[PDB]
Design a protein around this ligand. Sequence first.
Ligand SMILES: CC(=O)SCCNC(=O)CCNC(=O)[C@H](O)C(C)(C)COP(=O)(O)OP(=O)(O)OC[C@H]1O[C@@H](n2cnc3c(N)ncnc32)[C@H](O)[C@@H]1OP(=O)(O)O
Ligand SMILES: [Zn+2]
Lengths: 316, 316, 263, 57
Amino acid sequence: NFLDFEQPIAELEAKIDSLTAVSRQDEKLDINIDEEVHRLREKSVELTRKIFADLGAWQIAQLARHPQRPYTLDYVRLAFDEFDELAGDRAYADDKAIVGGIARLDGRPVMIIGHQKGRETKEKIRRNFGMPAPEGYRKALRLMQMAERFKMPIITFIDTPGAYPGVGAEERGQSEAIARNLREMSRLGVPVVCTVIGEGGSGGALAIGVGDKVNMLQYSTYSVISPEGCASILWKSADKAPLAAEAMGIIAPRLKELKLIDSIIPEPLGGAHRNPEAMAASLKAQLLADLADLDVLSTEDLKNRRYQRLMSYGYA
Amino acid sequence: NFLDFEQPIAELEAKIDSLTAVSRQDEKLDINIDEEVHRLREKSVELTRKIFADLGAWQIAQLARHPQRPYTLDYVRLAFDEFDELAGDRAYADDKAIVGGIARLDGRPVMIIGHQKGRETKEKIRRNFGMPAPEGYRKALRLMQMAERFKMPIITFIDTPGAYPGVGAEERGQSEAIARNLREMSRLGVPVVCTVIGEGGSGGALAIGVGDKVNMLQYSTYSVISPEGCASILWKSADKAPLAAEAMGIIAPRLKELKLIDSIIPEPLGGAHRNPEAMAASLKAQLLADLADLDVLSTEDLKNRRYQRLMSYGYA
Amino acid sequence: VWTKCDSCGQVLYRAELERNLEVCPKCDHHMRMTARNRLHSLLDEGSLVELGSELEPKDVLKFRDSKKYKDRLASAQKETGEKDALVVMKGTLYGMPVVAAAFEFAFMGGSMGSVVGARFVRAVEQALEDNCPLICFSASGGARMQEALMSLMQMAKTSAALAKMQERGLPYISVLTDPTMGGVSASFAMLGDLNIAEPKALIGFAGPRVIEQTVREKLPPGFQRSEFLIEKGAIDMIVRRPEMRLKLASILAKLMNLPAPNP
Amino acid sequence: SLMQMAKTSAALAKMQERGLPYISVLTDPTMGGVSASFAMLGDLNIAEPKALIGFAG
Ligand SMILES: CC(=O)SCCNC(=O)CCNC(=O)[C@H](O)C(C)(C)COP(=O)(O)OP(=O)(O)OC[C@H]1O[C@@H](n2cnc3c(N)ncnc32)[C@H](O)[C@@H]1OP(=O)(O)O
Ligand SMILES: [Zn+2]
């Protein structure tokens, strides 16, 4: 299900699939069909290149919510091996919105914490559409403490609308869970590398995003509040979301020049949905580079650098 | 409401009240009535002395459950000043069964954690009859960690039937709460003084009773399981509780000779319920004595002594 | 040589069941496994070294409820062949030195007594002096009632040993078998870094009967089972017994930064 | 604004490891990122009566 503005791209892909089926059906007209496929393949590449030349903030925000996109589990599958998933915060329940575990990154063992929106509607309602209850942030804190105990680096994926604003979730100290996560994550004695694949924000994303290195995909957003909410409160309307997205500056290049994130990971043409394998490979290379240049620093120097990075946020 | 075997004492007290009323009625016979009151007071004292000469294990257990007895709040009121009560584990709820706070012990600030059964039936059902949910042991751990942060000694009162065996309490990790309390309490860098006023055991009492100095009142019980349960499992009956109580050895002098507790605090004649003020004064003196010889030790030496004491439990 | 699975009422061939690690090949029901056999299956071949074999029950309380406690100890020792419930056996796991412990549920219900805590502390000390993971397979009905507080205080002692291990930074994986209730679930069984649990294992603090007596209602379906706990967060993961060895080896290799074990 | 939560929490961690107390008083209203950054992070969380405290409106 492509977005509204990607309909031409969808039509070309649909035509290619139809032609492939027709070619498999017959044998005496293979040459012409193959020639048309090659011509249409070149057309699709150029069309995707020209459309994406100038994308507004709202276009990027819509892309970050594309209902076909690699989530935390997909990245784990395509870039990590020997993944053992740990479930449970030990107090109330295990939140399916956050998936955590320990796996190997090119032999090196790492701890993986990130949100999981879910692919279909069943998983989407099972995982609360990637919105974690406080028992999810408590599980994340438990896993981070475990990783810091066994001298283990931590890798975090940030893809969630935000914290769940439910009655049950609010009774169990959502604010306390987020605050404890933020406080404890600045003292970890192991490097933390956080990426913002997909959509993140509202403060329920920063709860696992206080890291030594902050990365963001080219077409990913990271805001204090969803554009819809900002429009509703300030513009007094919900349809003026694109203006709010443009004004806030939720796009990766806008944040980079503010010294808020460390690097941007380029995505395959047409977004990370076209070639998830390439996106996973690029993310893995960036993670390896960040760990390579993070291990040189000592634990005390690493913590001091992290603290100084935090104190440099804002213009004051 | 005195126990079954203390009926003569109740009758004597009623007679004393009647004599007081009669004295208030008239004026020309006050001297003789006062003399009779004094004689009956001496009679009551001697009768209490002779009755308590030989009390069995079941008698002691019944005394420890007297429905008129100073609880944690009473001891705090009669031996501590400036008591500020802290409520909440920050996660699920604040358990009324455990009352915690920070107060002053002869000027010195201390942290107080203990169970509160409640006086009447309303408070008994509000406080779950002194049986704490896991959110009570989590509050206890939070308070103990706070006290250890601000170089503060910890005082614990152990008066509870045991952990609440409810469905809700079992779903929220009762075992995990108790285990975490036991593990964290052996590393505290501040002296911990634990007393076993009233009834404690089942492991939900040891969750706040791993201390440098363990004290117990003369008429208090401390067992791995209530005598009723031991009788039900082993004797195959519930009415044979006294035999189980005698066999287990749940009485303070019996436990002392096993090198399981450090000292026994003698109680006022007729139990701690007759004269709670004297009991509170004796407990305060014992606490001050225990703290006096614990402050000399360094933090590392205090922790080493605590660890070695734990490893000496049992014959193996 | 023809046993039966009670859960499904089959006629499983005994050797077939034994070579599958006491798991019914039909309904995958995890039945009783002796501590020594479990440790032999877990650890490598020819590297087993039992620890704390010099510790024996030494009843001092002279307990007598309906049978002499010494008679109970002798009967359990004759039936099971082990001095007390817990059995410690140092060994190697895929070339990785490790210390493992296993409960023996046939010894007075796997209750925790003084010798159990002493042997657990011996295992912890051995792991500490030679830095290596600790693995525990908890199968206990609670704390030994015939030892009174001398069993209750074993919770604090084992917890303190685990605290020392955590300070040193060593892993400690607690495998929760069926059943693990009472003072073992509340002291060191649920105190591990990863609380792995076997399928359909009765885990909790208080038994179902006392809970029913207090509530006087119907317990939720599948109460206190492993599958019910993992949804409540008390269990980190569920691992089948035939897959336990490799899963534990991989987990401990990842935690200790060792190379992955060869399958 | 969002990154200020991490900054304040890190400062509070620094003062906590020293042993200095930090009492947080919650007044009507204490919502949003303040409730999730340092308002709900003090050693004592004191709230005035009938104060609106939470994370989401
Ligand atoms: C307070 C404590 O910590 S001890 C209290 C007893 N335990 C509990 O309350 C928790 C669980 N309660 C139980 O009854 C069981 O452990 C359950 C629920 C797991 C049931 O498991 P079952 O298959 O029924 O095992 P069962 O209880 O029969 O145990 C087998 C044997 O161990 C004995 N046993 C088990 N735990 C203990 C113990 N703590 N002390 C003494 N004996 C014990 C039983 O008496 C029984 O002996 P028997 O068969 O010769 O009569
Ligand atoms: Zn079967």
